[PDB]
Structures are given as structure tokens and as C-alpha cells.
Amino acid sequence: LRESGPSLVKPSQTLSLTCTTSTVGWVRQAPGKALEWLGSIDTSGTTGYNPGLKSRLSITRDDSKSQVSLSLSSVTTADLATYYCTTVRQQVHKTCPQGWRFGWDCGFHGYGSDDCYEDCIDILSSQTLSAEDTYELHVDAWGQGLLVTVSSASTKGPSVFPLAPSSKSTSGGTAALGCLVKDYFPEPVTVSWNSGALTSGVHTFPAVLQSSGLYSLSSVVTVPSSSLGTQTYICNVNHKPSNTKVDKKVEPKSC
Amino acid sequence: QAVLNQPSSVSGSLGQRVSITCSGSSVGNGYVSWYQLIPGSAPRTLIYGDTSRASGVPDRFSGSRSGNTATLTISSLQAEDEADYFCASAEDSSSNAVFGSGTTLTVLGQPKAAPSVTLFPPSSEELQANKATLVCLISDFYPGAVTVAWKADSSPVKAGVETTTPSKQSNNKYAASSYLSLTPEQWKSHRSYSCQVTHEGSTVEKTVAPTECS
């Protein structure tokens, strides 16, 4: 389940996303809000939509390319959210009242066998009530989640600056070094270290939003102090909205 | 528009048991599933069909029902369980489901930890780009409650400051960040800048001076 599509869509426009794979649904979450169902579509092509959104929602599927599509028209800032591609299991369950029995459980397989019967066998032509339905739906698997920002502002790639350790900022055997990712738009920025080989002691912080309308964050790693003079540390900044990837080597200060 | 209401916040002690309730809008016609959302990760399905566990879900996660009220119980609370939990249910043959209001679970009794504070002055590269950002990084503290103040020559500074809310690191301890955005001229117009981090009756202050190399 791979969410693909723009991270930025302008107001009034129709957001359009795709989920490559190889019963699919869509869920989203706006900041500080609960999960919000959107819709799904099974192998038979039938579709279901959140009643409050089915006006603007449109979901398709290409069993050929194994690609499900979501189309949300006339988007507003209210549609700013993380959009999750999911897999759904749906199974309606039928039960009879206490005592009452299914026709097929009494031994009858003619017409009406799937209904409930108060009088079993005993002249089965008896009182017949439809079985009670209990619906079971849950998401099996979740996608990673694509962040969609809705705004008129223009994309801007980040400027990366080094957060270098110095002789007085060490902590004995350990030392902190990082990268400052400044003035980008929209979110998100992903940061790795040494192309994913360096994962321990790494922490990437949530971004701040400046009065300029632009974002900034920092990523830091605690490394051994002894290795600093010769070890190579590179932060890998990726900003898919601008298709910008920046690798910056962080050297320790000469003081 | 079925209303599944959860307590916005619930707290339990490490190793003990806790319950997150999911009550209906008022004939519970659908089964309840539960989901775990840890920031930076995609949601994780815990329980489905009121009481059945999903794949890879430990045994301490258990679900139960009592007529329009579903309960998620975590029998042996762990620190990695601090997260947001959402119930959900489909109320009809519609291929649609509704999610609960959500619960943020707090795990108390974790080991307290004083914050480490790292203060980076503006890089020579950023200063040569005609900008100056002081970066105060706060790491490895519990509980996740800090206030951050900036000082210029011991005089408080409130403008050009941005701070992030504490969030969990990979080791279940918290971290926060704060920035002071200045002009290169302002950076040199003082003899020192401080980042002051208060945490549980303790204040850690780190200082940088434009006249001394970090």
C-alpha cells in the first residue's frame, strides 16, 4: 500500500491520489482530529462513501495495474490531513433470537431456509422472522500515510545547515551533532543519517511554523566523542513536494 | 454519523492494568475494532470483532463489550503503550465505518530523567548566508513537561522564538526543540545568549557567546 500524489493542492482544486499494491479503503486524519473514514471498493467494483462526503468523493480501481484511486473535488483547508490507504475486511453476521433457529439448522433448505423459525421441524411452516444483522468492519493493514496540505502558497525547498559539535558541547564519551532544516513548504521533510545506516541515537524533531509561513526542523544524533576526528556523518534531507534531496556532511568545529 | 465517545485522556501505572472505553450514541448493531496511533508511525490494528486480537498483538491487549460499551484493556502496561487509541464500528450494510473520539493514554511511574540540553550557535555557513538561528535541543527527560526561556545578556527574549511540544524519542524518553531566529547584526549585538530549560524543580542553562567559538 503506497500512497502517491501531490503533497500540496490548491484550494477549490480536486485532490487526486493513488495507492499501488501487489478490498481497499481510504482513511484520513486532520491535525488534532479523529480518524475519518472516506470510502472503499471491493473486487466487484461496488463503492461506499462517508455519507457526509460522498458528494465530493470519487473512488476507482484498476485491477489491471493494481491501483486504487481517490478523488476529492473542491478541496478546502478542511481537507488538510494525512491520507491512509488501507485494506478492509467486511463480514455481515446473521443470528436468530434466543431459541429461534435458522431453517438450515433445523434441516430445511428450501425457500426461506436463511430465515429464523420459532418452531423447529414441528410443522416448519410456522412463524418466520428475518435474522438479525450485526455488521463487522475493520481495517486489516494501513499504509504509511501521505500528508496533503491545502494552501495557495508556493512550494519551497529547504536550506540545510550543520549543527556541529565543539570542544565544550561534548558529554564526555558522547557528543551531539545534527542538521538544521530551515524554511521549507509544505510539510513533510524526512531526514535520515548516512543514507539509513545510522539509526541509533537519532531523533528527528517535529517542525516549527515560522511567522514567514515556512517550516523548519532539526535532526540530531548522539555519537561517540572519540570517533569525531575521522568519522563521517551525513544527514539526508528529503523534501518530496519540491523533489529536493540534500545530503550535508556535518564536521566537528575546530575549537 | 454514529457517535463513539471515548475518554480524551486515560492514565495507568507501569505494569498495572488500564481500560479505554468506547460508548455508543444510543441497539449496538456493529462490532468494535481498536487501533493504536504512535506519532511518526502508521496506525496499528489491535482488536477486531469486539474481542479478537490481530496479528502480532501481545496478549495483554484484550477487548470486551457490555451493550453499547466496548472496552480495550491493557493488562500489563508498558512505556511503549503511551499512544492514541481509536475505536471504530460499522453501523449498517454500508461499506462505511465511524471512528471514536480517541483516547491519549499516559503511562505513569516511568523513571524520571533530567533533560540534557544542547545549544548550537548559528553556523558560519548560515551566518555567511545572512541569517542566524540558535538551536536549543532538549533530550532524554521524563515526564515530558518543560518550559523553555531564552536570554540575551541575561535579559529575557520573547520575540523570534519557536518551540516544539515534547514528543517521544525511540527510547520512550521525551525531547523538545526551541529556536531563536536573529539577524547577523543582532547576533553580534550581545555578548552571550542562554537557553534555560526548567524541568521538575530544576533549571539547566546553556550559554553561547558570539566572541567564543562554541
Numbering used by the authors:
A (entry chain H): 4 to 25, 33 to 82, 82A, 82B, 82C, 83 to 262
B (entry chain L): 1 to 9, 11 to 95, 95A, 95B, 96 to 106, 106A, 107 to 212
What does the article say, verbatim?
The cow antibody repertoire contains a unique subset (~10%) of antibodies possessing ultralong CDRH3s, which can reach lengths between 50 to 70 amino acids. The unique CDRH3 structure can be separated into two microdomains where the antigen-binding disulfide-bound “knob” sits on top of a long b-ribbon “stalk” and can bind to both surface and receded epitopes. Ultimately, we isolated a total of 8 and 11 cross-clade nAbs from cow-485 and cow-488, respectively, all of which had ultralong CDRH3s, suggesting only ultralong antibodies were responsible for cross-clade neutralization detected in sera. BnAbs from cow-485 were named Bess, while bnAbs from cow-488 were named ElsE and assigned numbers based on their order of discovery.
